[PDB]
Amino acid sequence: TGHSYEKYNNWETIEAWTKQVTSENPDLISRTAIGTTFLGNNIYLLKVGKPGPNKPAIFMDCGFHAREWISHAFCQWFVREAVLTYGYESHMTEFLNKLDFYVLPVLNIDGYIYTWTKNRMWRKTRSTNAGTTCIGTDPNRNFDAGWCTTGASTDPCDETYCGSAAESEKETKALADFIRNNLSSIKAYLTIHSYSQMILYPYSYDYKLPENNAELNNLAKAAVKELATLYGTKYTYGPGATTIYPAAGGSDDWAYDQGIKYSFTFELRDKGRYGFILPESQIQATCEETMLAIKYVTNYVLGHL
Ligand SMILES: N=C(N)Nc1cccc([C@H](CP(=O)(O)CCCc2ccccc2)C(=O)O)c1
Ligand SMILES: [Zn+2]
Numbered sequence: 001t002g003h004s005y006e007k008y009n010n011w012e013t014i015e016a017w018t019k020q021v022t023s024e025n026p027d028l029i030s031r032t033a034i035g036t037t038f039l040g041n042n043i044y045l046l047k048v049g050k051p052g053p054n055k056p057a058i059f060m061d062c063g064f065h066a067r068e069w070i071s072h073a074f075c076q077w078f079v080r081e082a083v084l085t086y087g088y089e090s091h092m093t094e095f096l097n098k099l100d101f102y103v104l105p106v107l108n109i110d111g112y113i114y115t116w117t118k119n120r121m122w123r124k125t126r127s128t129n130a131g132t133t134c135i136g137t138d139p140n141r142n143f144d145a146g147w148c149t150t151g152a153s154t155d156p157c158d159e160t161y162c163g164s165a166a167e168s169e170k171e172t173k174a175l176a177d178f179i180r181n182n183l184s185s186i187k188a189y190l191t192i193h194s195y196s197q198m199i200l201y202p203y204s205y206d207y208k209l210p211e212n213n214a215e216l217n218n219l220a221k222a223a224v225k226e227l228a229t230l231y232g233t234k235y236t237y238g239p240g241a242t243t244i245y246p247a248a249g250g251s252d253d254w255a256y257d258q259g260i261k262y263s264f265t266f267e268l269r270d271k272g273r274y275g276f277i278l279p280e281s282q283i284q285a286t287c288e289e290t291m292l293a294i295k296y297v298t299n300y301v302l303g304h305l
Contacts, residue, residue: 001013003016003017003020003076005073005076005077005080005283005284005287006280006283006284007280007283008069008072008073008280008283009072009073009076010113010116011041011106011109011112011113011116014072014076014105014106015042015044017076018031018044018046018105019031021046021079021080021083022046024083025083027050027051028048028049028050028082028083028086028096029046029047029048029079029083030046030047030051031044031045031046031047032044032045032047033045034104034174034175034177034178035170035171035173035174035175035177036170036174037108037109037110037125037170037171038110038125038126038127038128038169038170038171039109039110039113039126041109041110041113042109043104043106043107043109043171043174043175044104044105044106045102045103045104045178046079046101046102046103046104046105047100047101047102047103048079048082048083048096048100048101048102048103049095049096049097049099049100049101050086050096050097052097054185055098055099055100055185056098056099056100056185056186056187056302056305057099057100057101057102057182057185057186057187058099058100058101058102058186058187058188058189058190058298058301059101059102059104059179059182059186059188059189059190059255059260060075060078060101060102060103060104060189060190060191060192060294061075061103061104061107061175061190061191061192061251062074062075062103062104062105062106062107062191062192063075063104063105063106063107063108063109063112063192064107064108064139064140064191064193064251065108065111065123065138065139065140065193066108066111066112066114066115066122066123066124067111067115067120067121067122067123067276068123068193068194068195068268068276069115069194069276069277069278070194070195070268070269070278070282070283070286071192071193071194071268072105072106072112073283073286073287074192074268074286074287074290075103075104075105075106075192076105077283077287077291078101078103078287078291078294079103079105081291082095082096082101091295091299092295094302095295095298095299095302098302099187099298099302100185101298102182102186104175107139107171107172107175108124108125108139108171109171110125110126110127110171111123111124111125111126111136113126114126120276120277121276122136123138123159124136124137124138124139124159124161125137125138125139125169125171127168127169127170129156129161129164130164132156132157134155134156134157134161135156136156136161137156137161137162137163137164137168137169138152138159138160138161138162138163138249139169139171139172139251140191140193140247140249140250140251141160141161141162141163141247141248141249141250142162142163142166142167142168142169142172142249143166143167143172143176143249143250143251143253143254144166144167144176144249144254145203145205145248145249145250145253145254145257146203146205146206146248146249146253147162147166147248147249148162148163148166148248148249149205149248150205150206150246150247150248151204151205151245151246151247151248152247152248152249160247162248162249163249166249172251175251176254179255179258179260180258183258183259183260186260187260187261187262187301187305188260188261188262188263188264188297188298188301189251189252189255189256189260189262189263189264190263190264190266190294190297191251191252191264191265191266192266192268192290193265193266193267193268194267194268194269194276194278195267195268195269195270195271195272195274195275195276195278196244196267196271196272197233197234197235197236197267197268197269197270197271198235198236198237198243198244198265198266198267199220199223199224199235199236199237199264199265199266199267199293200237200238200239200240200243200244200252200264200265200266200267201213201216201217201220201237201238201239201240201252201256201263201264201265202216202239202240202252202253202256202257202263203239203240203241203253203256204239204240204241204244204246204247204248204250204252204253205241205246205247205248205249205250205253206241206246206248207239207241207242207246209239210239210256212261213239216262217237217238219262219297219300220237220238220264221237222296222300223237223293223296223297224236224237224293226292226293226296227289227290227292227293228289229292230285230288230289230292231285231289233269233289235293240252240253240265244267250265252264252265262297262300262301264297266290266293266294268286268290269282269286270282
């Protein structure tokens with residue numbers, strides 16, 4: 001039950017943590033909920049930064065995919081590092097003064113609970129589907145970006161089911177609703193996954209390249225170089241379609257086509273030795289090196305608005 005930053009925490013524990021870290025840091029963190037899940041859990045959002053007028057923001061979510069436990073761990077790690085180093089480390093101090101980080105600790109809460117209780121390898125949501133006993137939609141194929149046109153299934157029984165319609169899932173509708181309602185301020189979108197050690201940018205739903213792909217490639221390149229300084233961990237990077245494989249309906253592509261010009265999917269450790277079942281013993285090293293890339297991106301975005 002007790003929360004630890006070097007262990008994977010269950011939802012009850014993460015929920016208690018969002019309340020605790022917010023009460024302990026009132027001038028640095030506010031908590032709201034942006035929606036409920038299919039099974040009635042609260043989708044918490046943390047706003048991290050020193051409040052002020054007309055602040056730009058960066059949006060980061062974790063836990064799209066239930067089994068990718070290091071993703072959830074990173075969002076929690078980020079929040080503590082922000083509050084611990086504010087006022088002492090120049091860069092984080094400037095970040096929190098000038099912008100807000102929206103941190104969504106766990107999007108697909110229902111699936112995450114399922115990985116703790118029944119099936120460690122679950123990935124989808126846990127919503128019911130008409131006409132079948134098969135459960136769940138892949139939330140990262142459920143966005144309105146070339147929806148269900150490639151790299152996706154129309155069968156609810158498949159792991160890549162794109163859903164009955166774009167934003168059919170309460171969770172993805174809640175996230176899209178929030179982003180749409182905050183487009184004027186959100187300057188970047190970061191979505192945290194594992195595994196494969198990559199930084200992806202648009203597009204995945206099509207082989208076409210984003211208008212600013214040269215810029216996005218240079219930024220990804222610089223970010224993976226920064227990440228490698230700590231433990232030598234090697235990341236690859238590029239447009240999703242060629243860097244992994246085509247897949248429609250992803251939140252990074254959707255956010256980009258909303259006008260959020262800096263949109264990245266992070267795939268964290270490792271490369272397949274442990275895969276989704278990354279040992280807790282690697283949480284600290286993974287989070288620490290990932291922090292460097294996230295901060296590099298953040299500084300770049302701040303210098304380009
Ligand atoms: N919009 C996007 N970024 N779409 C996208 C493109 C390629 C891959 C993915 C995800 C990757 P993921 O988050 O589950 C991590 C997959 C890790 C992996 C890697 C190799 C073999 C088996 C498993 C997917 O397969 O749904 C999304
Ligand atoms: Zn994933």
